[PDB]
Amino acid sequence: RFVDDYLPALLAQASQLISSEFHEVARQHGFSVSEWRVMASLAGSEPISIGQLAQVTVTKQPTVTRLLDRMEARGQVERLPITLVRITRKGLKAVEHLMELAREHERRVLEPFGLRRAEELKQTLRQMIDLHVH
Amino acid sequence: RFVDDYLPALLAQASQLISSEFHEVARQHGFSVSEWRVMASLAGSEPISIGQLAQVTVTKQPTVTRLLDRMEARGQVERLPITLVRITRKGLKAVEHLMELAREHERRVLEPFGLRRAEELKQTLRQMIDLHVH
Ligand SMILES: O=C(O)Cc1c[nH]c2ccccc12
Numbered sequence: 001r002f003v004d005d006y007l008p009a010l011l012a013q014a015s016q017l018i019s020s021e022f023h024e025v026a027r028q029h030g031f032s033v034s035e036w037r038v039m040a041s042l043a044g045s046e047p048i049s050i051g052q053l054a055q056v057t058v059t060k061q062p063t064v065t066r067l068l069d070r071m072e073a074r075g076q077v078e079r080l081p082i083t084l085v086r087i088t089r090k091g092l093k094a095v096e097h098l099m100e101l102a103r104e105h106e107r108r109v110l111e112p113f114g115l116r117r118a119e120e121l122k123q124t125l126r127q128m129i130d131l132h133v134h
Numbered sequence: 135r136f137v138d139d140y141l142p143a144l145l146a147q148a149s150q151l152i153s154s155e156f157h158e159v160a161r162q163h164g165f166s167v168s169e170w171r172v173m174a175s176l177a178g179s180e181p182i183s184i185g186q187l188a189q190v191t192v193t194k195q196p197t198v199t200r201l202l203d204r205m206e207a208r209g210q211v212e213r214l215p216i217t218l219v220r221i222t223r224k225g226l227k228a229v230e231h232l233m234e235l236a237r238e239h240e241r242r243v244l245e246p247f248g249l250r251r252a253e254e255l256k257q258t259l260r261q262m263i264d265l266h267v268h
């Protein structure tokens with residue numbers, strides 16, 4: 001069957017299944033998917049452009065702008081003059097424990113594969129992103 | 135930065151970027167993303183359940199049911215008595231050339247990585263899907 005070994009289908013299924021597991025945890029901790037992606041993407045980061053944030057969070061830029069309107073109103077992020085965006089201390093403290101849980105979940109996902117295969121997967125994915133980003 | 139090496143973020147970005155490239159081709163050939171996923175998933179397949187189709191096409195089941203209503207009206211798929219679904223000859227002929235283009239695009243995406251790394255990636259993704267599917 002074509003779909004059994006078609007790379008874009010494999011990537012999309014693996015991504016949806018693993019992400020859906022963690023999204024249940026995020027919601028139980030009071031986060032929507034989009035708020036989790038924004039805060040996790042900005043944590044530990046220098047300010048980045050709205051367009052960079054949209055790419056890394058895999059969210060359309062007009063959707064990101066609406067999201068930032070409300071997250072900035074809640075004091076979790078700040079836009080700065082191309083517009084840059086950063087997480088605030090309030091946002092970092094809000095997301096820090098969830099980030100620890102995300103690392104634990106990722107470790108569980110990767111444990112059956114071993115360190116070599118896990119690092120090879122992450123390296124390949126990073127190289128693909130850097131080759132295909134606009 | 136957390137997000138630079140967080141597996142779910144890497145999978146989702148790689149998946150979106152590679153898929154968006156092929157989706158431009160699909161649209162230029164008159165297909166929506168959802169129609170392409172359904173026909174490509176059913177091509178060469180025995181009939182599968184609606185729930186299986188929803189998982190492999192990464193589409194919510196109520197969305198799939200609406201999609202199948204219109205694709206069946208156009209004679210591209212058929213539902214059969216758990217409901218099973220298959221592609222028809224009309225659907226297969228409609229999607230065959232696009233599938234060839236999809237294989238060519240996939241070959242281009244994977245060529246910089248070489249056969250060993252490409253097969254390792256596909257194997258890891260398949261194993262992850264089979265471990266995380268419900
Ligand atoms: O939601 C997911 O699991 C996928 C994803 C895409 N971009 C992200 C940025 C930060 C954290 C997770 C994600």
Ligand SMILES: O=C(O)Cc1c[nH]c2ccccc12
Nearest residue numbers: 008009012153171174190191
């Ligand atoms: O649209 C994409 O490229 C991802 C995708 C997810 N499930 C699919 C089934 C068949 C073809 C492509 C896909």
